[PDB]
Amino acid sequence: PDLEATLRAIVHSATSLVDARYGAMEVHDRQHRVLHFVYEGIDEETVRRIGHLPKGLGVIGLLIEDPKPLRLDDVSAHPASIGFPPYHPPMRTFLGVPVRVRDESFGTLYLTDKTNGQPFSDDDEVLVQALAAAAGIAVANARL
Amino acid sequence: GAMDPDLEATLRAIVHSATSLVDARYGAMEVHDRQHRVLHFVYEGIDEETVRRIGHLPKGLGVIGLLIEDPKPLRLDDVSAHPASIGFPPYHPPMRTFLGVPVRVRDESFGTLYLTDKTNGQPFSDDDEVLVQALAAAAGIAVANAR
Numbered sequence: 001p002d003l004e005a006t007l008r009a010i011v012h013s014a015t016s017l018v019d020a021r022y023g024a025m026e027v028h029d030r031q032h033r034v035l036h037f038v039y040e041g042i043d044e045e046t047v048r049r050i051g052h053l054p055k056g057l058g059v060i061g062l063l064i065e066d067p068k069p070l071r072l073d074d075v076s077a078h079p080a081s082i083g084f085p086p087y088h089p090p091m092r093t094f095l096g097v098p099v100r101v102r103d104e105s106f107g108t109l110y111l112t113d114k115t116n117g118q119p120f121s122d123d124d125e126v127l128v129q130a131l132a133a134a135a136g137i138a139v140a141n142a143r144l
Numbered sequence: 145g146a147m148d149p150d151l152e153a154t155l156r157a158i159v160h161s162a163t164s165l166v167d168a169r170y171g172a173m174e175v176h177d178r179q180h181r182v183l184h185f186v187y188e189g190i191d192e193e194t195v196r197r198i199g200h201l202p203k204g205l206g207v208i209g210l211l212i213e214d215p216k217p218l219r220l221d222d223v224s225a226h227p228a229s230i231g232f233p234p235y236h237p238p239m240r241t242f243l244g245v246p247v248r249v250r251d252e253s254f255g256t257l258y259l260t261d262k263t264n265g266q267p268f269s270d271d272d273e274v275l276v277q278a279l280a281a282a283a284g285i286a287v288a289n290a291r
């Protein structure tokens with residue numbers, strides 16, 4: 001059972017189901033080390049140009065710190081925003097939710113740039129929570 | 145006994161999102177074993193009093209029974225008009241429009257996610273079927289991994 005592939009399929013589904021241009025999932029350990037980073041909407045050449053993987057700083061760092069849903073009209077405007085690295089696609093609208101089970105949170109599922117230029121909806125948020133939950137069971141199952 | 149609580153919350157959340165996403169009046173999911181024996185059932189859209197009047201849970205017969213045995217997407221304008229249909233039990237809401245999809249992974253199917261009575265009064269669309277398939281595949285990842 002390839003967990004990386006499983007998490008990637010979840011991200012793929014999330015991006016499609018809520019019409020985001022971009023989607024990503026980070027999964028970390030308790031020491032906040034990056035275990036998995038999977039994504040959709042970004043070409044391999046761009047990925048290469050970005051270079052270093054995200055470390056879970058800024059806005060995602062906020063959700064790792066306090067796991068709960070967060071929608072933003074403009075992720076750059078958030079006080080905690082660290083900004084994009086060189087070569088990274090610019091992104092504006094944002095939806096992120098923990099990837100968890102009841103006992104523990106392991107990750108964050110996040111989507112940007114809904115293709116209609118609108119912020120993500122309440123319904124979008126609830127849907128992504130549901131997909132996140134399926135991911136959470138996968139992660140919990142890989143741990144113990 | 146009871147479903148694993150994380151699995152149960154997940155499967156409930158999926159039914160809920162599916163029901164909202166495709167504008168269905170009612171939404172349900174059955175999960176069965178490899179012998180096709182129904183083990184768990186979750187649903188939404190039916191009040192507690194009605195559930196009490198209905199009484200017995202579904203056994204995986206009729207149209208859902210068909211989908212358990214031959215797992216693939218099925219849309220119907222009028223579910224009770226299908227040749228495999230067994231009919232609604234006493235006190236069950238009558239239901240017309242139907243969308244049902246298997247809950248599965250590559251090598252195994254565990255269940256069926258199904259929705260009825262789209263609120264616009266129309267049948268469920270191609271778009272509806274595609275999206276509910278995506279929610280069902282997520283349910284499949286969850287079932288396979290709770291296990």
Ligand code: HEM
Pocket residue numbers: 022023024039040041042047050051052053054055056057058059060061075076080081082083084085088091094110111112
């Ligand atoms: C395609 C899906 C992606 C999404 C939705 C996404 C989203 C974001 C967002 C919203 C930020 C800003 C956070 C802030 O301002 O605080 C950010 C920063 C960042 N991104 Fe991405 N990104 C994606 C792909 C990638 C890829 C492929 C890489 C590199 C392989 C990457 C590397 C980074 C890095 C290094 C940061 C700085 C913050 C950190 O290290 O945590 N991103 N990303």
Ligand code: HEM
Pocket residue numbers: 170171172187188189190195198199200201202203204205206207208209223224228229230231232233236239242258259260
């Ligand atoms: C609210 C979500 C529900 C949906 C979408 C739904 C859908 C359906 C449909 C379409 C049928 C017809 C099958 C056929 O004619 O072959 C059916 C039958 C049946 N329903 Fe439901 N129903 C729901 C709730 C319930 C509840 C809450 C109960 C019990 C408390 C129940 C008990 C039954 C039983 C016993 C049958 C006969 C077939 C069988 O045993 O599997 N249903 N349902």
Ligand SMILES: [C-]#N
Pocket residue numbers: 024054060
């Ligand atoms: C992007 N992390």
Ligand SMILES: [C-]#N
Pocket residue numbers: 172202208
């Ligand atoms: C009703 N099953």
Ligand SMILES: [Ca+2]
Pocket residue numbers: 164165167
């Ligand atoms: Ca709607």
